[PDB]
Amino acid sequence: YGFSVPGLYECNRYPCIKEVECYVSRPTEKTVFLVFMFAVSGICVVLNLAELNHL
């Protein structure tokens, strides 16, 4: 997923003719959620590594 959800999408899949533009719902909230989940997972990874090193 990367780090952001863009508001526009370029689509060229059948049955769409040539290339079309599509518009996403709540891109900013989804980007915020993505970044927050990444940060929480990183904190969890750091804590797990610290415990494992302590072992």
Q: How far is the CB of 20 from its own copies (least distance, A)?
A: 7
User: Out of 13, 14, 17, 23, which residue is the one contacting its own copies (CB under 8 A)?
Assistant: 17
Report residue 26 as tokens.
């709540």
Rule CB under 8 A: say whether 13 interacts with its own copies.
Answer: no
Omega before 27 within 30 of 0, i.e. cis: no
- Residue 16 makes contact with its own copies by CB under 8 A: no
Given the rule CB under 8 A, which of 18-26, 28-36, 39-47 is the region that contacts its own copies?
A: 18-26
Residues with Cβ within 8 Å of 13's Cβ and at least 6 positions away in sequence, in order, are: none
